Design an enzyme around this catalytic site. Structure first.
Site, PDB file in Angstrom:
ATOM      1  N   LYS A  41     -11.634  -3.356  -4.825  1.00 53.10           N
ATOM      2  CA  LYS A  41     -12.769  -4.170  -4.386  1.00 53.10           C
ATOM      3  C   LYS A  41     -14.003  -3.953  -5.292  1.00 53.10           C
ATOM      4  O   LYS A  41     -14.938  -3.163  -4.991  1.00 53.10           O
ATOM      5  CB  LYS A  41     -12.961  -3.932  -2.901  1.00 53.10           C
ATOM      6  CG  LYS A  41     -11.814  -4.577  -2.076  1.00 53.10           C
ATOM      7  CD  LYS A  41     -11.964  -4.484  -0.584  1.00 53.10           C
ATOM      8  CE  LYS A  41     -10.595  -4.776   0.156  1.00 53.10           C
ATOM      9  NZ  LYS A  41     -10.154  -6.211   0.043  1.00 53.10           N
TER      10      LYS A  41
ATOM     11  N   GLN B 154     -10.216  -0.275  11.102  1.00 56.10           N
ATOM     12  CA  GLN B 154      -9.521  -1.568  10.919  1.00 56.10           C
ATOM     13  C   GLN B 154      -9.360  -2.285  12.270  1.00 56.10           C
ATOM     14  O   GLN B 154      -9.037  -1.642  13.279  1.00 56.10           O
ATOM     15  CB  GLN B 154      -8.137  -1.356  10.285  1.00 56.10           C
ATOM     16  CG  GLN B 154      -7.243  -2.625  10.076  1.00 56.10           C
ATOM     17  CD  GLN B 154      -7.832  -3.591   9.069  1.00 56.10           C
ATOM     18  OE1 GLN B 154      -8.965  -4.038   9.235  1.00 56.10           O
ATOM     19  NE2 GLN B 154      -7.064  -3.913   8.009  1.00 56.10           N
ATOM     20  N   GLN B 155      -9.561  -3.603  12.276  1.00 57.71           N
ATOM     21  CA  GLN B 155      -9.362  -4.426  13.452  1.00 57.71           C
ATOM     22  C   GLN B 155      -8.370  -5.531  13.118  1.00 57.71           C
ATOM     23  O   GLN B 155      -8.492  -6.149  12.081  1.00 57.71           O
ATOM     24  CB  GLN B 155     -10.658  -5.110  13.845  1.00 57.71           C
ATOM     25  CG  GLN B 155     -11.765  -4.090  14.100  1.00 57.71           C
ATOM     26  CD  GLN B 155     -13.059  -4.758  14.441  1.00 57.71           C
ATOM     27  OE1 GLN B 155     -13.485  -4.706  15.590  1.00 57.71           O
ATOM     28  NE2 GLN B 155     -13.686  -5.408  13.456  1.00 57.71           N
TER      29      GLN B 155
ATOM     30  N   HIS C 143      -2.066  -1.986  -5.216  1.00 59.40           N
ATOM     31  CA  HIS C 143      -3.060  -1.008  -5.038  1.00 59.40           C
ATOM     32  C   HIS C 143      -2.955   0.075  -6.110  1.00 59.40           C
ATOM     33  O   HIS C 143      -2.559   1.195  -5.817  1.00 59.40           O
ATOM     34  CB  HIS C 143      -2.894  -0.442  -3.646  1.00 59.40           C
ATOM     35  CG  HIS C 143      -4.179  -0.104  -3.012  1.00 59.40           C
ATOM     36  ND1 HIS C 143      -4.437  -0.354  -1.677  1.00 59.40           N
ATOM     37  CD2 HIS C 143      -5.304   0.441  -3.532  1.00 59.40           C
ATOM     38  CE1 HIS C 143      -5.653   0.079  -1.397  1.00 59.40           C
ATOM     39  NE2 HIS C 143      -6.200   0.567  -2.506  1.00 59.40           N
TER      40      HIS C 143
ATOM     41  N   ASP D 102       0.846  -1.187   0.000  1.00 55.96           N
ATOM     42  CA  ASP D 102       0.000   0.000   0.000  1.00 55.96           C
ATOM     43  C   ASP D 102       0.882   1.237   0.000  1.00 55.96           C
ATOM     44  O   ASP D 102       1.078   1.848   1.044  1.00 55.96           O
ATOM     45  CB  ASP D 102      -0.939  -0.046   1.206  1.00 55.96           C
ATOM     46  CG  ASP D 102      -2.003  -1.160   1.068  1.00 55.96           C
ATOM     47  OD1 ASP D 102      -2.420  -1.782   2.104  1.00 55.96           O
ATOM     48  OD2 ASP D 102      -2.383  -1.455  -0.107  1.00 55.96           O
TER      49      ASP D 102
ATOM     50  N   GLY E  10      -0.215  -5.450   5.545  1.00 52.79           N
ATOM     51  CA  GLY E  10       0.322  -4.205   4.973  1.00 52.79           C
ATOM     52  C   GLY E  10       1.207  -3.484   5.974  1.00 52.79           C
ATOM     53  O   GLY E  10       2.441  -3.700   6.016  1.00 52.79           O
ATOM     54  N   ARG E  11       0.562  -2.647   6.793  1.00 47.72           N
ATOM     55  CA  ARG E  11       1.244  -1.793   7.712  1.00 47.72           C
ATOM     56  C   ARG E  11       2.102  -2.555   8.713  1.00 47.72           C
ATOM     57  O   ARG E  11       3.135  -2.063   9.136  1.00 47.72           O
ATOM     58  CB  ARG E  11       0.268  -0.859   8.404  1.00 47.72           C
ATOM     59  CG  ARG E  11      -0.211   0.301   7.546  1.00 47.72           C
ATOM     60  CD  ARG E  11      -1.438   0.999   8.086  1.00 47.72           C
ATOM     61  NE  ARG E  11      -2.671   0.205   7.860  1.00 47.72           N
ATOM     62  CZ  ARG E  11      -3.882   0.626   8.187  1.00 47.72           C
ATOM     63  NH1 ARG E  11      -4.045   1.819   8.773  1.00 47.72           N
ATOM     64  NH2 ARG E  11      -4.929  -0.159   7.940  1.00 47.72           N
TER      65      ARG E  11
ATOM     66  N   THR F 171     -20.681  -2.954 -15.786  1.00 56.15           N
ATOM     67  CA  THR F 171     -19.699  -1.929 -15.371  1.00 56.15           C
ATOM     68  C   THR F 171     -18.396  -2.589 -14.933  1.00 56.15           C
ATOM     69  O   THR F 171     -17.333  -2.191 -15.364  1.00 56.15           O
ATOM     70  CB  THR F 171     -20.269  -1.070 -14.209  1.00 56.15           C
ATOM     71  OG1 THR F 171     -21.305  -0.206 -14.711  1.00 56.15           O
ATOM     72  CG2 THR F 171     -19.139  -0.239 -13.546  1.00 56.15           C
TER      73      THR F 171
ATOM     74  N   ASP G 257     -19.937  -3.446  -8.431  1.00 54.53           N
ATOM     75  CA  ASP G 257     -20.845  -2.727  -9.302  1.00 54.53           C
ATOM     76  C   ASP G 257     -21.581  -3.793 -10.102  1.00 54.53           C
ATOM     77  O   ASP G 257     -21.310  -4.966  -9.999  1.00 54.53           O
ATOM     78  CB  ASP G 257     -20.064  -1.793 -10.215  1.00 54.53           C
ATOM     79  CG  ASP G 257     -20.849  -0.511 -10.588  1.00 54.53           C
ATOM     80  OD1 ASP G 257     -22.062  -0.588 -10.873  1.00 54.53           O
ATOM     81  OD2 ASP G 257     -20.219   0.562 -10.575  1.00 54.53           O
TER      82      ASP G 257
HETATM   83  C1  LIG Z   1     -24.129   2.920  -9.297  1.00 61.35           C
HETATM   84  C2  LIG Z   1     -24.505   4.376  -9.599  1.00 61.35           C
HETATM   85  C3  LIG Z   1     -25.100   1.971  -9.652  1.00 61.35           C
HETATM   86  C4  LIG Z   1     -25.755   1.262  -8.638  1.00 61.35           C
HETATM   87  C5  LIG Z   1     -26.682   0.314  -9.035  1.00 61.35           C
HETATM   88  O1  LIG Z   1     -27.348  -0.300  -8.155  1.00 61.35           O
HETATM   89  N1  LIG Z   1     -27.032   0.151 -10.318  1.00 61.35           N
HETATM   90  C6  LIG Z   1     -26.392   0.808 -11.295  1.00 61.35           C
HETATM   91  O2  LIG Z   1     -26.702   0.623 -12.477  1.00 61.35           O
HETATM   92  N2  LIG Z   1     -25.411   1.759 -10.938  1.00 61.35           N
HETATM   93  C7  LIG Z   1     -24.671   2.458 -12.012  1.00 61.35           C
HETATM   94  O3  LIG Z   1     -25.528   3.219 -12.817  1.00 61.35           O
HETATM   95  C8  LIG Z   1     -25.194   3.071 -14.213  1.00 61.35           C
HETATM   96  C9  LIG Z   1     -26.327   2.308 -14.862  1.00 61.35           C
HETATM   97  O4  LIG Z   1     -26.179   2.444 -16.277  1.00 61.35           O
HETATM   98  P1  LIG Z   1     -27.266   1.854 -17.318  1.00 61.35           P
HETATM   99  O5  LIG Z   1     -28.386   2.869 -17.372  1.00 61.35           O
HETATM  100  O6  LIG Z   1     -27.696   0.471 -16.890  1.00 61.35           O
HETATM  101  O7  LIG Z   1     -26.445   1.905 -18.615  1.00 61.35           O
HETATM  102  C10 LIG Z   1     -23.971   2.199 -14.340  1.00 61.35           C
HETATM  103  O8  LIG Z   1     -22.812   3.104 -14.461  1.00 61.35           O
HETATM  104  C11 LIG Z   1     -23.932   1.479 -12.984  1.00 61.35           C
HETATM  105  O9  LIG Z   1     -22.541   1.239 -12.688  1.00 61.35           O
HETATM  106  C1  LIG Z   2      -9.288  -6.186   1.096  1.00 63.13           C
HETATM  107  C2  LIG Z   2      -8.208  -7.215   0.729  1.00 63.13           C
HETATM  108  C3  LIG Z   2      -9.552  -5.988   2.478  1.00 63.13           C
HETATM  109  C4  LIG Z   2     -10.723  -6.475   3.032  1.00 63.13           C
HETATM  110  C5  LIG Z   2     -10.886  -6.311   4.396  1.00 63.13           C
HETATM  111  O1  LIG Z   2     -11.924  -6.721   4.955  1.00 63.13           O
HETATM  112  N1  LIG Z   2      -9.951  -5.681   5.119  1.00 63.13           N
HETATM  113  C6  LIG Z   2      -8.810  -5.213   4.581  1.00 63.13           C
HETATM  114  O2  LIG Z   2      -7.986  -4.626   5.292  1.00 63.13           O
HETATM  115  N2  LIG Z   2      -8.614  -5.361   3.226  1.00 63.13           N
HETATM  116  C7  LIG Z   2      -7.389  -4.788   2.625  1.00 63.13           C
HETATM  117  O3  LIG Z   2      -6.209  -5.377   3.169  1.00 63.13           O
HETATM  118  C8  LIG Z   2      -5.169  -4.425   3.455  1.00 63.13           C
HETATM  119  C9  LIG Z   2      -4.950  -4.373   4.964  1.00 63.13           C
HETATM  120  O4  LIG Z   2      -3.762  -3.579   5.231  1.00 63.13           O
HETATM  121  P1  LIG Z   2      -3.255  -3.367   6.740  1.00 63.13           P
HETATM  122  O5  LIG Z   2      -2.480  -4.622   7.085  1.00 63.13           O
HETATM  123  O6  LIG Z   2      -4.432  -3.022   7.653  1.00 63.13           O
HETATM  124  O7  LIG Z   2      -2.219  -2.244   6.502  1.00 63.13           O
HETATM  125  C10 LIG Z   2      -5.705  -3.073   2.993  1.00 63.13           C
HETATM  126  O8  LIG Z   2      -5.215  -2.862   1.631  1.00 63.13           O
HETATM  127  C11 LIG Z   2      -7.225  -3.281   2.957  1.00 63.13           C
HETATM  128  O9  LIG Z   2      -7.721  -2.401   1.925  1.00 63.13           O
END
Ligand SMILES: *[C@H](C)c1cc(=O)[nH]c(=O)n1[C@@H]1O[C@H](COP(=O)(O)O)[C@@H](O)[C@H]1O
Ligand SMILES: *[C@H](C)c1cc(=O)[nH]c(=O)n1[C@@H]1O[C@H](COP(=O)(O)O)[C@@H](O)[C@H]1O
Lengths: 257, 257
Positions: A92, A208-209, A61, A37, A228-229, A99, A95
């Site tokens: 993560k 974070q835990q 990342h 990170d 990470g850290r 998308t 969507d």
């Molecule tokens: C995020 C805004 C989101 C959440 C969701 O529950 N449903 C979604 O469709 N979206 C986002 O909205 C547009 C939908 O585009 P279309 O009209 O289906 O082309 C997408 O960008 C989607 O990621």
């Molecule tokens: C994603 C892998 C994730 C999911 C989660 O529930 N908790 C997380 O911490 N992470 C990701 O893992 C590293 C954790 O780094 P640290 O050891 O806390 O520095 C982060 O990149 C986090 O986004």
């Protein structure tokens, strides 16, 4: 009966990306994933080179890399091949199918072009997996579903977690395991990777835990720790990586008997 | 008990970004957010210019923009100022607080520097809001929480949705509303934006489901429609945006009395 990483790598239903990972974990005696990170490509590449021998996986990342280019990723792949670790992109995905498909293949990052593994949230329903798999399967990639989270107030519990496990089971051509705090699937073809790991008790100031390698690998049955850290903030990052590797490796061996 | 957008812009507890939005919705007679899901800067900017008069908001998708630069976003901000719409970045933040902070402020995209609004998933717990808030608060940004999703198999139901509403209520200095399929909060200070909208019945092949502007605004009580493919796939995107604008606006006008 618990199987070794080496034996799991040979299971008939094993995904090739999981098999590759499991073989190198056994070969290298490491079930440590480094969470890289950092803001700069030079730091990323320096950590990948120095800690490569100690890790099974490097979690990138790219959304926080100020000087990302595809050449940085070419060079990271060379290090991955030389030191033998997989590349896992942190983003993560969360969507709708249409998308995430584009987010995975496209943009400036072209994640699917260099990441062996991605992870996805299951909140959108199985279309999130179906979209990623449309890009990942041709590119020989695998995916982890986020079944539990490490942070305070996580909603990834109960029926949500169970939904993640069913989704994974139903997409085993692409889904190779989970981001989780514990073993959530009884099927040995799935990997369990656990973040929120440090040797000492505590947390951060944004929810974070932390739990220890022994707790998560040994008592809770996970396979791989993501750190990470705990490593990056240490004065001696190589020594820290080694303490984490040894801790996670011994916890696995003990569970193995 | 229904207030116009203009009256809601004057509510005592309203966030300034929400106020700015509600005022321009009322002035322009639009509650249409264009989901600009395109891969080329030139198309983004051409759509932004041409459709700017018809929309209250443009939803960017920078993770799919192949030729992103900060200069492209500079030109977008010029168009947003000219035509009077807000910029909403699509990236559905869904990580622990310490990570989302960096994803929002940093990397190549520097989202917080140009986006008025961001959206976050609530699955990690309230750390996700706290992390984004640390960046966005001084910049007078706001955030929407994803309370419900449009896609088949969505887990954003029931107690999950309730948790999102509670989290928004407890962080009203930064959270200005929701991504949802219907009105989820009774507090008129919150905006409700609804994706999964098209004039015709149907869906896509990756889990998306559509409802009409009249159903979503008129019967479900949402405020703004988010529309991507219903507009972007038309031959004439302007004519399409106008159809969606009139549908959503008249649906709003009718629920007013
Ligand atoms: C995020 C805004 C989101 C959440 C969701 O529950 N449903 C979604 O469709 N979206 C986002 O909205 C547009 C939908 O585009 P279309 O009209 O289906 O082309 C997408 O960008 C989607 O990621
Ligand atoms: C994603 C892998 C994730 C999911 C989660 O529930 N908790 C997380 O911490 N992470 C990701 O893992 C590293 C954790 O780094 P640290 O050891 O806390 O520095 C982060 O990149 C986090 O986004």
């Amino acid at each position: 009966m618990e199987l070794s990483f080496g034996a799991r790598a040979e299971l008939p239903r094993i995904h090739p990306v999981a098999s590759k990972l499991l073989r190198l974990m056994q070969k290298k005696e490491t079930n440590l994933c480094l969470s890289a990170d950092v803001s700069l490509a030079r730091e990323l590449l320096q950590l990948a080179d120095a800690l490569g021998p100690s890790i099974c996986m490097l979690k990138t990342h790219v959304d926080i890399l100020n000087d990302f280019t595809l050449d940085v990723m070419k060079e990271l792949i060379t290090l991955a091949k030389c030191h033998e670790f997989l590349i896992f992109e942190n983003r993560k995905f969360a969507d709708i199918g249409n998308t995430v498909k584009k987010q995975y293949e496209g943009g400036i990052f072209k994640i699917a072009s260099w990441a062996d593994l991605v992870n996805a949230h299951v909140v959108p329903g199985s279309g999130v997996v179906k979209g990623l798999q449309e890009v990942g399967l041709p590119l020989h990639r695998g995916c982890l579903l986020i079944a539990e989270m490490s942070s305070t107030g996580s909603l990834a519990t109960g029926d949500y977690t169970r939904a993640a496990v069913r989704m994974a089971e139903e997409h085993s051509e692409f889904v190779v395991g989970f981001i989780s705090g514990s073993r959530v699937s009884m099927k040995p073809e799935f990997l369990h990777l656990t973040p929120g790991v440090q040797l000492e008790a505590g947390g951060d100031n944004l929810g974070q835990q932390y739990n220890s390698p022994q707790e998560v690998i040994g008592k809770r049955g996970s396979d791989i720790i993501i750190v990470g850290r705990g490593i990056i903030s240490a004065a001696d990052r190589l020594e820290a990586a080694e303490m984490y590797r040894k801790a996670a490796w011994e916890a696995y061996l003990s569970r193995l008997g």
